[PDB]
Structure formats: C-alpha cells, structure tokens
Amino acid sequence: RTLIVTTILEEPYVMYRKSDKPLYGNDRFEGYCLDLLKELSNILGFLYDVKLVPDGKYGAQNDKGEWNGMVKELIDHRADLAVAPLTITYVREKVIDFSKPFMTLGISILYRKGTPIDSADDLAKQTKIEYGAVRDGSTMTFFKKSKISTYEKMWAFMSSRQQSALVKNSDEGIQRVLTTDYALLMESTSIEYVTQRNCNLTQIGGLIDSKGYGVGTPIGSPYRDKITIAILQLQEEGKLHMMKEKWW
Amino acid sequence: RTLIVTTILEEPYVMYRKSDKPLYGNDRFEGYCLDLLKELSNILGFLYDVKLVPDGKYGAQNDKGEWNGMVKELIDHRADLAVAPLTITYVREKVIDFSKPFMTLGISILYRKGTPIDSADDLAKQTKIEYGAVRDGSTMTFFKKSKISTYEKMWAFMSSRQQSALVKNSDEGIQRVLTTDYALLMESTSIEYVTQRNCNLTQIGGLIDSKGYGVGTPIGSPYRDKITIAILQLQEEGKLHMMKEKWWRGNGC
Ligand SMILES: C/C(=C/C=C/[C@@H](C)C(=O)O)[C@H]1CN[C@H](C(=O)O)[C@H]1CC(=O)O
Ligand SMILES: C/C(=C/C=C/[C@@H](C)C(=O)O)[C@H]1CN[C@H](C(=O)O)[C@H]1CC(=O)O
C-alpha cells in the first residue's frame, strides 16, 4: 500500500523543482527530505505520495486544545508519515509518535556581522536591538514556557507590544534582520543554511538548547520503529551527513 | 511496583559515593544518571532499585548472535530500565526499545595538546602515531562497519596486529594517551569530561558522526514512551543542561 506523506515547503528540506513545464506528483519536489524519504523507502520497501499539508502549518494547538497542520494530519490518520523539519517537542510527542531524530540542532541567534553582541544574554540586557522568533513555532514556545530568568526576560520583550517583535515566517525574519536592527532566534540548522548564502549574516553565540527533527507518525504506528532503525542505519553509514552537505 | 534499573559504573554517570562506612542500596551511587533517574521517577512516579549489571558489560552480540550486558538484562526482562551512557545504535535498537536521547554526542579524538594533528584524516594518512578505541564498544563497531574510505583505512590499522591498537576500557585508553604517542577515538561527552580534568589532553577535530544516549527498556515496554516524554520535558526546562554542568565542570585549566 502507498503511504501518504504529509509535508510542508521549506528550504532546503522540501522545495518545488525547477522545470519549464508543469510538474506532477512527487516529481514536483526536491530537497533533503525527499532524499531522506527515498532512502527510507528503499530500506523499508514502500511506495509513497507526497502531499503538502492543506493548511500549510507544522502543528500547534489552539486554546481549546485542538491541533492543526501536519501534527493534525497524523492524528486524524490522513497521513502515515510526516517528513519535514518538524521539531521533536514535549507537547507534540504526546499526541504523535516520533522516530529517533535524523538531525540534531538547537535554538541560536541570527544577526548581522561585525557587532559587539555575542550571546542571548547580551540581547536580554538591552532594548535598542529588537529580537524575536517565528510566531507559534517551537522556538517561540520554548521562550514562552521557560522559567530561566534570561529567557523569561526575553519572552517578556518578545511578547510585549502585541508581539510586534515576532515574525510570521523565517523569510520575513531574515529580511527583517538584513534591513533593520533586528536579531532572529532561529534553529541552528536553518542559520547554517542562511549564513552560507548571505555573507552579511552570522550566528551569534552557540546553541541554547538541544533539539532534533524526526519523522512523524500517528500514535501506535507500526512504521515508527522501522523508520527509527532505518535512520540509525543511514546515520551510521554517513548518508545523513552526506545529504546534509549536498543541500547545505 | 519497584522498577529494577540495570546500570554500570562509569564516570561521571554512575559512581560509588564517598563515605566512611559501608553503603547500601541506591545510596551506594551518585552521578548524572542517578540524578536523571530520580528526576524521571518524580515525573513518572515510580520507585526503583539500582542494580549493577552482573557481567559489567554494556551489550554486544557474539558470533552466535547472543547478547550480553545491560542489553541482555533488558532482553530477558531482568531489568525494566537501563540508565547509563548506552549509545543508541542500529544493532541495539533492533533488540530493545530506546527512549529519545537525553544527551547527544559524537565520535571524536582524544590526543595530547600542542601537536600538528587536527583531524581523523591526519591520523589515517600515517603510522607513526598509533590510534584505536575501546574494544567492542560502539565506537569500534562504527569503524568496523564503515565503508567510508578514511574510516575503512583506520579500521584496517586498528584491527591489525591482533588489535594491539585497541584498549579494554576508557581509563586504559586515557593512560595510554598520556604516556605514549597514542590517540583515542572516544565519545565527545567523555572527551569533554577528561580534557576538563587533564590540561595536557584535548579534543582533536570535531565530531565524525552524531549519536545519542538513551534510557533502555525491553521491547514492548509501557515505560518507553512515558520516559521519552519526561526526557523532552526535562530538556525543555533546562534540567538536562543543568545536570550536565553539575557533573562535567572541572577546576579550570
Ligand atoms: C520554520 C518553522 C516554521 C513554523 C511555523 C509555524 C508557526 C506554523 O506555521 O505552523 C518551524 C521549523 N521547525 C520549528 C517547529 O517545528 O515548530 C519551526 C521553526 C522554529 O520554531 O524555530
Ligand atoms: C565507555 C564505554 C565502554 C564500553 C565498553 C564495552 C566494550 C563493554 O565492556 O561492554 C561505552 C560508552 N558508550 C559506548 C557504548 O554504549 O557502547 C562505549 C564507548 C565507545 O564505544 O566509544
């Protein structure tokens, strides 16, 4: 049986291929996740239809506790797998089963080069330089729930003034960093990608936490473990590292 | 019901406490893993008896496909959990269920300071400097199964001459590095611990792979997921990071 794979567009994980004529099916996409997906499909032996998540969201829960995006697709069994830079979080792992991480990363700071700023603490102590994150993303949630003083303070600032310091998506954040005096709290894997394509930007400090991206499956899914094992196999033989180098 | 926790002695994960009189039970140990364990027990609400694995091995399989150590304890249901720097590997994950990693790391190089060597490649190209790893550990296995040229070459050297380049345990490896012209392939978390207490030693290059340590449970265990969720919780609130700092920090160099 063909597995339905729910995903979302995000450089360089899942992107529309470049072609002179209209593309159809899986042929529409390319990227690290499509490469990962075909590696997993060879190892486990399954066919799949990549399908973009209808609402274009990763998955968060509203005030009433209902989920949206890819997480929701898995919960309602509208998809068998979720392959994308879907951060393994406490709140998400309770409603869906994650495979072991296929990429590890952390929350860090994207800012422009040649400045005295060097840590999340430097930012927390002032207000001249504005800073924030993608609204409702795992990074924002981290700062929202943290009880570490420095992070509590930063959240106080990010959420103030109607969350004007937050951005809707990564691209809006990057442009905001390139144009104004703004710093973006962003996942390290994404910062590496960006700083490699824009010499004006750089990472500030190191990681302020350790996270991973995993393949999502519905709770009780028989593939969860098979995928985990395949990921470990791909990691141990250098394929994951090879794939990262290819797209980064 | 009290859960039986199988573990092994390894600084600074599980160590014998220092005391004037004989110690008994869980009171015998201290370390990062005992701290982790009590955090998990508070969150999940269970009691536990720490018990050192009888044969003192982590878990590898012999030629007949038989497992030993902690992995074996879990397979035969002699323990409910395995809490130790037990590397999550392909071969192990097939016989036991692992929680999500509570610590991520990689294979790196422990060598002495002030030398021209700077990468696994530098080592692979020569033979003056001897190098190896703990025999039968996950690191050795990595090199044994790799098909990457540089690692294939290093394995060729490590396994040659009856594996004389390999060591029985981390301490033998560290002493060998401090005394002779030898480099030790070792997990990054352990290198950090050592270099912080030995200003003569240092890490060479970065990580040559990405691994994690996880709590082990028997296949089909009802705790696997509960523990995973608790670990994510502890990570998200800074406790795992806090615990690492508590046991890793040295006295400066
Ligand atoms: C790039 C990104 C955007 C998320 C946007 C959310 C608000 C959504 O549209 O559902 C994701 C990638 N991984 C994080 C997550 O899974 O939450 C998030 C980025 C981040 O939060 O740093
Ligand atoms: C310090 C260590 C010693 C393992 C010794 C094996 C040969 C044993 O006696 O069971 C462990 C720590 N994590 C690895 C593992 O889980 O296999 C191994 C060290 C390593 O292989 O680099």
Coordinates of C-alpha atoms and ligand atoms in Angstrom, one line a residue:
Chain A
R1 CA 0.0 0.0 0.0
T2 CA 1.2 3.5 -0.8
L3 CA 1.9 5.6 2.2
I4 CA 0.6 9.2 2.3
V5 CA 3.5 11.5 3.3
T6 CA 2.4 14.9 4.6
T7 CA 5.0 17.6 4.3
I8 CA 5.4 21.4 4.0
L9 CA 7.6 23.6 1.8
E10 CA 10.8 24.8 3.5
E11 CA 14.3 25.4 2.1
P12 CA 16.2 23.2 1.7
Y13 CA 14.1 20.3 3.1
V14 CA 11.2 20.4 0.6
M15 CA 11.1 22.6 -2.4
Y16 CA 9.5 22.9 -5.8
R17 CA 11.8 21.6 -8.6
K18 CA 12.7 24.0 -11.4
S19 CA 11.2 22.9 -14.7
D20 CA 9.9 24.5 -18.0
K21 CA 6.7 22.6 -17.9
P22 CA 4.1 21.8 -15.2
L23 CA 5.2 19.1 -12.7
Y24 CA 3.0 16.4 -11.2
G25 CA 3.2 14.1 -8.1
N26 CA 6.4 13.5 -6.2
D27 CA 8.2 14.9 -9.2
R28 CA 7.1 18.3 -8.0
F29 CA 9.5 18.3 -5.1
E30 CA 13.2 18.0 -4.3
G31 CA 15.3 18.6 -1.2
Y32 CA 16.9 16.9 1.8
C33 CA 13.6 15.4 3.0
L34 CA 12.7 13.9 -0.5
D35 CA 16.2 12.4 -0.4
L36 CA 15.7 11.1 3.1
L37 CA 12.3 9.8 2.1
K38 CA 13.5 7.8 -0.9
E39 CA 16.4 6.4 1.2
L40 CA 13.8 5.2 3.9
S41 CA 11.6 3.8 1.2
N42 CA 14.4 1.8 -0.3
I43 CA 15.3 0.3 3.1
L44 CA 11.8 -0.4 4.3
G45 CA 10.4 -1.0 0.9
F46 CA 7.3 1.2 0.5
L47 CA 5.7 3.5 -2.1
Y48 CA 4.6 6.9 -1.2
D49 CA 2.6 10.0 -2.3
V50 CA 4.0 13.3 -1.0
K51 CA 1.1 15.6 -0.2
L52 CA 1.5 19.2 1.1
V53 CA -0.4 19.8 4.3
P54 CA -3.6 21.6 3.3
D55 CA -3.3 24.5 5.9
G56 CA 0.4 24.9 5.5
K57 CA 1.2 24.7 9.2
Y58 CA 3.5 22.4 11.1
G59 CA 1.3 21.8 14.1
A60 CA 0.4 23.7 17.2
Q61 CA -2.7 23.5 19.5
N62 CA -5.3 26.3 20.0
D63 CA -6.7 27.4 23.3
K64 CA -9.3 24.6 23.1
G65 CA -6.6 22.0 22.7
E66 CA -7.2 21.2 19.0
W67 CA -4.2 20.6 16.7
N68 CA -3.6 21.9 13.2
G69 CA -1.1 21.2 10.4
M70 CA 1.0 18.1 9.9
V71 CA 0.5 17.1 13.5
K72 CA -3.2 17.1 12.9
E73 CA -2.9 15.2 9.7
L74 CA -1.2 12.4 11.6
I75 CA -3.7 12.5 14.5
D76 CA -6.6 12.0 12.1
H77 CA -4.8 9.4 10.1
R78 CA -4.9 11.4 6.9
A79 CA -1.2 10.7 6.5
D80 CA 1.1 7.9 7.5
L81 CA 4.3 9.9 7.9
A82 CA 5.3 13.5 8.4
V83 CA 8.7 14.3 6.8
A84 CA 9.9 17.8 7.4
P85 CA 12.0 19.9 9.8
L86 CA 9.4 19.0 12.4
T87 CA 10.9 19.7 15.8
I88 CA 10.5 16.9 18.4
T89 CA 8.9 18.7 21.3
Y90 CA 7.3 17.7 24.6
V91 CA 3.9 18.9 23.6
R92 CA 3.9 17.2 20.2
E93 CA 5.4 13.9 21.3
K94 CA 2.3 13.4 23.5
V95 CA 0.0 13.3 20.5
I96 CA 2.0 11.6 17.8
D97 CA 4.9 9.1 17.7
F98 CA 8.3 10.5 16.5
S99 CA 11.1 8.4 15.1
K100 CA 14.6 9.0 16.6
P101 CA 16.0 12.3 15.4
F102 CA 17.5 12.3 11.9
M103 CA 19.1 15.7 12.5
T104 CA 20.1 17.4 15.8
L105 CA 20.1 21.1 16.3
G106 CA 19.5 23.9 18.7
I107 CA 18.0 27.4 19.1
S108 CA 20.5 30.0 18.3
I109 CA 20.7 33.7 17.1
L110 CA 20.9 35.0 13.5
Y111 CA 22.1 38.6 13.4
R112 CA 24.4 40.6 11.1
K113 CA 28.2 40.5 11.2
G114 CA 30.6 42.9 12.9
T115 CA 28.6 43.7 16.0
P116 CA 29.5 43.6 19.8
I117 CA 26.6 41.2 20.5
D118 CA 27.7 37.7 21.4
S119 CA 25.1 35.9 23.4
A120 CA 21.4 35.7 24.2
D121 CA 22.3 37.4 27.4
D122 CA 23.7 40.4 25.6
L123 CA 20.4 40.8 23.9
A124 CA 18.3 40.3 27.1
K125 CA 20.1 43.1 28.9
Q126 CA 19.1 45.8 26.3
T127 CA 16.3 47.2 24.2
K128 CA 18.0 49.1 21.3
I129 CA 18.3 45.9 19.3
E130 CA 14.9 44.2 18.7
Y131 CA 14.7 40.4 18.6
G132 CA 12.1 37.7 18.2
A133 CA 11.1 34.5 16.5
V134 CA 8.5 32.9 14.2
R135 CA 5.2 33.2 15.9
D136 CA 3.8 29.9 17.2
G137 CA 6.9 28.0 16.2
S138 CA 8.7 25.6 18.5
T139 CA 11.3 28.3 19.2
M140 CA 8.8 30.8 20.4
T141 CA 7.1 28.2 22.6
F142 CA 10.5 27.5 24.2
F143 CA 10.8 31.1 25.3
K144 CA 7.2 31.2 26.3
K145 CA 7.4 28.2 28.7
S146 CA 10.9 28.8 30.0
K147 CA 11.5 29.7 33.7
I148 CA 15.2 30.6 33.2
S149 CA 15.5 34.3 34.1
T150 CA 17.3 35.4 31.0
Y151 CA 14.8 33.6 28.8
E152 CA 11.8 34.8 30.9
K153 CA 13.1 38.3 30.3
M154 CA 13.5 37.8 26.6
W155 CA 10.0 36.4 26.4
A156 CA 8.7 39.4 28.2
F157 CA 10.2 41.6 25.5
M158 CA 9.1 39.4 22.5
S159 CA 5.5 39.2 23.6
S160 CA 5.2 42.9 24.5
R161 CA 3.6 45.5 22.2
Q162 CA 1.3 42.9 20.7
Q163 CA 4.2 40.6 19.8
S164 CA 5.5 43.2 17.2
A165 CA 8.9 41.6 17.7
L166 CA 7.7 38.3 16.3
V167 CA 7.6 37.4 12.5
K168 CA 5.2 35.1 10.6
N169 CA 7.8 33.0 8.9
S170 CA 11.6 32.5 8.5
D171 CA 11.9 34.6 5.3
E172 CA 10.2 37.6 6.9
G173 CA 12.6 37.2 9.8
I174 CA 15.7 37.0 7.6
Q175 CA 14.6 40.1 5.6
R176 CA 14.0 41.9 8.9
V177 CA 17.5 41.0 10.1
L178 CA 19.0 42.2 6.8
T179 CA 17.1 45.5 6.8
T180 CA 16.7 46.7 10.4
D181 CA 18.5 46.4 13.7
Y182 CA 16.8 43.0 14.5
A183 CA 18.1 39.7 15.7
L184 CA 16.2 36.4 15.0
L185 CA 16.1 33.4 17.4
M186 CA 16.2 30.6 14.9
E187 CA 17.1 26.9 14.7
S188 CA 20.8 26.3 14.1
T189 CA 20.3 24.1 11.0
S190 CA 18.4 27.0 9.4
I191 CA 21.0 29.6 10.4
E192 CA 23.8 27.5 8.8
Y193 CA 21.8 27.4 5.6
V194 CA 21.3 31.1 5.6
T195 CA 24.7 32.3 6.7
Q196 CA 26.2 30.2 3.9
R197 CA 24.2 32.2 1.3
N198 CA 24.5 35.6 2.9
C199 CA 27.9 36.8 4.0
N200 CA 26.3 39.7 5.8
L201 CA 24.7 37.4 8.4
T202 CA 26.2 35.1 11.0
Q203 CA 25.3 33.0 14.0
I204 CA 25.6 34.7 17.4
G205 CA 26.8 32.5 20.3
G206 CA 26.1 28.8 20.4
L207 CA 23.0 26.7 21.0
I208 CA 20.8 27.5 23.9
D209 CA 19.2 24.0 23.9
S210 CA 19.4 20.7 22.1
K211 CA 16.6 19.5 19.8
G212 CA 16.1 17.1 16.9
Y213 CA 14.0 16.7 13.8
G214 CA 12.1 13.4 13.4
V215 CA 9.8 11.7 11.1
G216 CA 6.3 11.9 12.4
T217 CA 3.8 9.0 12.5
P218 CA 0.4 8.5 14.2
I219 CA 0.4 7.1 17.7
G220 CA 0.6 3.3 17.6
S221 CA 2.0 3.3 14.1
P222 CA 3.9 0.1 13.0
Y223 CA 6.4 2.2 11.0
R224 CA 7.7 4.3 13.8
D225 CA 10.3 1.7 14.9
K226 CA 11.1 0.5 11.4
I227 CA 11.9 4.1 10.5
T228 CA 13.9 4.8 13.6
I229 CA 16.1 1.8 12.8
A230 CA 16.5 2.9 9.2
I231 CA 17.5 6.3 10.3
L232 CA 20.2 4.9 12.7
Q233 CA 21.4 2.8 9.8
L234 CA 21.6 5.8 7.4
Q235 CA 23.4 7.8 10.1
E236 CA 26.0 5.1 10.9
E237 CA 27.0 4.8 7.2
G238 CA 27.4 8.5 6.6
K239 CA 24.4 9.1 4.4
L240 CA 22.6 11.6 6.6
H241 CA 25.8 13.6 6.8
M242 CA 26.3 13.3 3.0
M243 CA 22.7 14.5 2.4
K244 CA 23.2 17.5 4.6
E245 CA 26.3 18.5 2.8
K246 CA 24.6 18.2 -0.5
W247 CA 21.8 20.6 0.3
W248 CA 23.6 22.9 2.7
Chain B
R1 CA 5.9 -1.8 41.9
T2 CA 9.6 -1.0 42.2
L3 CA 11.4 -1.0 38.8
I4 CA 14.8 -2.7 38.5
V5 CA 17.3 -0.4 36.9
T6 CA 20.3 -2.1 35.4
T7 CA 23.4 0.1 35.2
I8 CA 27.2 0.1 35.0
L9 CA 29.9 2.2 36.7
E10 CA 31.3 5.0 34.5
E11 CA 32.4 8.5 35.5
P12 CA 30.5 10.7 35.9
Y13 CA 27.3 8.9 35.0
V14 CA 27.3 6.2 37.8
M15 CA 29.9 6.2 40.6
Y16 CA 30.3 4.9 44.1
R17 CA 29.7 7.6 46.7
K18 CA 32.5 8.5 49.1
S19 CA 31.7 7.5 52.7
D20 CA 33.4 6.5 55.9
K21 CA 31.1 3.5 56.4
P22 CA 29.7 0.8 54.1
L23 CA 26.9 1.9 51.8
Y24 CA 23.8 0.0 50.8
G25 CA 21.2 0.1 48.0
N26 CA 20.8 3.2 45.8
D27 CA 22.7 5.1 48.4
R28 CA 25.8 3.4 47.0
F29 CA 25.8 5.5 43.9
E30 CA 25.8 9.1 42.7
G31 CA 26.2 10.8 39.3
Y32 CA 24.5 12.2 36.4
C33 CA 22.4 9.1 35.7
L34 CA 21.3 8.8 39.3
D35 CA 20.2 12.5 39.1
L36 CA 18.4 11.8 35.8
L37 CA 16.8 8.7 37.3
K38 CA 15.4 10.5 40.3
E39 CA 14.1 13.2 38.0
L40 CA 12.3 10.7 35.9
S41 CA 11.0 8.9 38.9
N42 CA 9.5 12.1 40.3
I43 CA 7.8 12.9 37.0
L44 CA 6.5 9.4 36.2
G45 CA 6.1 8.4 39.9
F46 CA 7.9 5.1 40.4
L47 CA 10.3 3.5 42.9
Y48 CA 13.5 1.8 41.8
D49 CA 16.4 -0.4 42.8
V50 CA 19.6 0.3 41.0
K51 CA 21.5 -2.9 40.2
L52 CA 24.9 -3.1 38.6
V53 CA 24.9 -5.4 35.6
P54 CA 26.4 -8.7 36.7
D55 CA 28.9 -9.1 33.9
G56 CA 29.8 -5.4 33.8
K57 CA 29.3 -5.0 30.0
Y58 CA 27.1 -2.6 28.1
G59 CA 25.8 -5.0 25.5
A60 CA 27.2 -6.5 22.3
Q61 CA 26.4 -9.7 20.5
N62 CA 28.7 -12.7 20.0
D63 CA 29.3 -14.7 16.8
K64 CA 26.2 -16.8 17.5
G65 CA 24.1 -13.7 17.9
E66 CA 23.9 -13.8 21.7
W67 CA 23.7 -10.6 23.7
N68 CA 25.4 -9.8 26.9
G69 CA 25.4 -6.9 29.5
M70 CA 22.7 -4.4 30.1
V71 CA 21.2 -5.1 26.7
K72 CA 20.8 -8.8 27.7
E73 CA 19.4 -7.8 31.0
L74 CA 16.6 -6.0 29.3
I75 CA 16.0 -8.7 26.7
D76 CA 15.5 -11.3 29.4
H77 CA 13.3 -9.0 31.4
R78 CA 15.7 -9.0 34.4
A79 CA 15.5 -5.2 34.4
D80 CA 12.9 -2.6 33.5
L81 CA 15.3 0.2 32.6
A82 CA 18.9 0.7 31.6
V83 CA 20.3 4.1 32.6
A84 CA 23.8 4.7 31.5
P85 CA 25.9 6.2 28.7
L86 CA 24.3 3.5 26.5
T87 CA 24.7 4.6 22.9
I88 CA 21.7 4.3 20.7
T89 CA 22.8 2.1 17.8
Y90 CA 21.3 0.4 14.9
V91 CA 22.2 -3.1 16.1
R92 CA 20.9 -2.4 19.7
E93 CA 17.7 -0.7 18.8
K94 CA 16.6 -3.8 17.0
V95 CA 16.6 -5.8 20.2
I96 CA 15.5 -3.3 22.8
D97 CA 13.4 -0.1 22.9
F98 CA 15.3 3.2 23.4
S99 CA 13.8 6.4 24.7
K100 CA 14.6 9.6 22.8
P101 CA 18.2 10.6 23.5
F102 CA 18.8 12.5 26.8
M103 CA 22.3 13.5 25.6
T104 CA 23.6 13.9 22.1
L105 CA 27.2 13.4 21.2
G106 CA 29.6 12.1 18.6
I107 CA 32.8 10.1 18.0
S108 CA 35.9 12.3 18.3
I109 CA 39.6 12.2 19.0
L110 CA 41.4 12.5 22.4
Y111 CA 45.1 13.3 22.0
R112 CA 47.6 15.4 23.7
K113 CA 48.0 19.2 23.2
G114 CA 50.5 21.0 21.0
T115 CA 50.6 18.7 18.0
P116 CA 50.1 19.2 14.3
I117 CA 47.4 16.6 14.1
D118 CA 44.0 18.1 13.5
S119 CA 41.6 15.5 12.0
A120 CA 40.8 11.8 11.7
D121 CA 42.2 12.2 8.2
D122 CA 45.6 13.3 9.5
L123 CA 45.7 10.1 11.6
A124 CA 44.6 7.9 8.7
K125 CA 47.5 9.1 6.5
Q126 CA 50.2 7.9 8.8
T127 CA 51.5 5.2 11.1
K128 CA 53.9 6.9 13.5
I129 CA 51.0 7.9 15.8
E130 CA 49.1 4.8 16.9
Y131 CA 45.3 5.1 17.5
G132 CA 42.4 3.0 18.5
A133 CA 39.3 2.6 20.6
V134 CA 37.7 0.6 23.3
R135 CA 37.4 -3.0 22.0
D136 CA 33.8 -4.0 21.2
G137 CA 32.4 -0.6 22.1
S138 CA 30.0 1.3 19.8
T139 CA 32.9 3.4 18.5
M140 CA 34.9 0.4 17.4
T141 CA 31.9 -1.1 15.8
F142 CA 31.4 2.2 13.9
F143 CA 34.8 1.9 12.3
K144 CA 34.4 -1.8 11.7
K145 CA 31.2 -1.4 9.7
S146 CA 32.0 1.9 7.9
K147 CA 32.6 1.9 4.1
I148 CA 33.9 5.5 4.1
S149 CA 37.5 5.2 2.7
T150 CA 39.2 7.2 5.5
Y151 CA 37.4 5.1 8.2
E152 CA 38.0 1.9 6.3
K153 CA 41.7 2.6 6.4
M154 CA 41.6 3.5 10.1
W155 CA 39.8 0.2 10.8
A156 CA 42.5 -1.6 8.8
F157 CA 45.1 -0.2 11.1
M158 CA 43.1 -0.6 14.4
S159 CA 42.4 -4.2 13.7
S160 CA 45.9 -5.1 12.5
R161 CA 48.5 -6.8 14.7
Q162 CA 45.8 -8.6 16.8
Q163 CA 44.1 -5.3 17.6
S164 CA 47.1 -4.2 19.6
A165 CA 45.9 -0.6 19.0
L166 CA 42.6 -1.2 20.9
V167 CA 42.2 -0.8 24.6
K168 CA 39.9 -2.7 27.1
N169 CA 38.4 0.4 28.6
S170 CA 38.4 4.2 28.7
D171 CA 40.8 4.5 31.5
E172 CA 43.4 2.3 29.9
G173 CA 42.9 4.4 26.8
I174 CA 43.4 7.7 28.6
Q175 CA 46.6 6.5 30.3
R176 CA 47.8 5.2 27.0
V177 CA 47.3 8.7 25.5
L178 CA 49.1 10.4 28.5
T179 CA 52.0 8.0 28.4
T180 CA 52.8 7.1 24.7
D181 CA 52.2 8.6 21.3
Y182 CA 48.7 7.3 21.0
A183 CA 45.3 8.8 20.1
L184 CA 42.0 7.5 21.3
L185 CA 38.8 7.6 19.3
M186 CA 36.2 8.3 22.0
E187 CA 32.7 9.7 22.5
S188 CA 32.7 13.5 22.7
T189 CA 30.9 13.7 26.0
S190 CA 33.7 11.6 27.6
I191 CA 36.4 13.7 26.0
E192 CA 34.9 16.9 27.5
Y193 CA 34.9 15.3 30.9
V194 CA 38.6 14.2 30.5
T195 CA 40.0 17.4 29.0
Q196 CA 38.4 19.4 31.8
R197 CA 40.5 17.4 34.3
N198 CA 43.6 16.9 32.2
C199 CA 45.1 20.1 30.8
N200 CA 47.6 18.0 28.9
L201 CA 44.8 16.5 26.8
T202 CA 42.4 18.0 24.2
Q203 CA 39.9 17.1 21.6
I204 CA 41.2 16.8 18.0
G205 CA 38.9 18.0 15.2
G206 CA 35.1 17.8 15.6
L207 CA 32.6 15.0 15.6
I208 CA 32.7 12.4 12.9
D209 CA 29.1 11.3 13.5
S210 CA 26.0 12.1 15.6
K211 CA 24.8 9.8 18.3
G212 CA 22.8 9.9 21.5
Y213 CA 22.5 8.2 24.9
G214 CA 19.0 6.9 25.7
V215 CA 17.3 5.1 28.5
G216 CA 16.9 1.4 27.6
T217 CA 13.8 -0.6 28.1
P218 CA 12.6 -4.1 26.9
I219 CA 10.8 -4.3 23.6
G220 CA 7.1 -3.6 24.1
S221 CA 7.7 -1.8 27.4
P222 CA 5.0 0.6 28.5
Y223 CA 7.5 3.0 30.0
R224 CA 9.5 3.7 26.8
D225 CA 7.1 6.5 25.7
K226 CA 6.5 7.8 29.2
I227 CA 10.2 8.2 29.7
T228 CA 10.7 9.8 26.3
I229 CA 8.1 12.4 27.1
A230 CA 9.7 13.1 30.5
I231 CA 13.1 13.5 29.0
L232 CA 11.8 16.1 26.5
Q233 CA 10.2 17.9 29.4
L234 CA 13.5 17.9 31.3
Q235 CA 15.3 19.1 28.3
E236 CA 12.9 21.9 27.5
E237 CA 13.2 23.3 31.1
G238 CA 17.0 23.3 31.2
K239 CA 17.4 20.5 33.7
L240 CA 19.4 18.1 31.5
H241 CA 21.8 21.0 30.7
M242 CA 21.9 21.9 34.4
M243 CA 22.8 18.3 35.3
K244 CA 25.5 18.1 32.7
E245 CA 27.1 21.3 34.0
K246 CA 27.0 19.9 37.6
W247 CA 28.9 16.7 36.8
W248 CA 31.2 17.9 34.0
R249 CA 32.7 21.2 35.2
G250 CA 36.3 20.8 36.3
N251 CA 38.5 23.3 38.1
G252 CA 39.7 25.3 35.1
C253 CA 42.9 24.9 33.1
Ligands
LIG1 C1 10.5 27.0 10.2 C2 9.3 26.7 11.1 C3 8.1 27.5 11.0 C4 7.0 27.2 11.7 C5 5.8 27.9 11.6 C6 4.6 27.5 12.5 C7 4.1 28.7 13.3 C8 3.5 27.1 11.5 O1 3.3 27.8 10.5 O2 2.8 26.1 11.8 C9 9.3 25.5 12.0 C10 10.5 24.6 11.7 N1 10.7 23.8 13.0 C11 10.0 24.6 14.1 C12 8.8 23.9 14.5 O3 8.6 22.7 14.2 O4 8.0 24.5 15.3 C13 9.6 26.0 13.5 C14 10.8 26.9 13.5 C15 11.1 27.5 14.8 O5 10.1 27.5 15.7 O6 12.2 27.9 15.1
LIG2 C1 32.6 3.8 27.8 C2 32.0 2.6 27.1 C3 32.7 1.4 27.2 C4 32.1 0.2 26.7 C5 32.8 -1.0 26.8 C6 32.3 -2.3 26.2 C7 33.3 -2.9 25.3 C8 31.8 -3.2 27.3 O1 32.7 -3.6 28.1 O2 30.6 -3.5 27.3 C9 30.7 2.7 26.3 C10 30.1 4.1 26.4 N1 29.2 4.2 25.3 C11 29.7 3.3 24.3 C12 28.6 2.2 24.1 O3 27.5 2.4 24.6 O4 29.0 1.1 23.5 C13 31.0 2.7 24.8 C14 32.2 3.7 24.5 C15 32.5 3.6 23.0 O5 32.2 2.6 22.3 O6 33.1 4.6 22.5

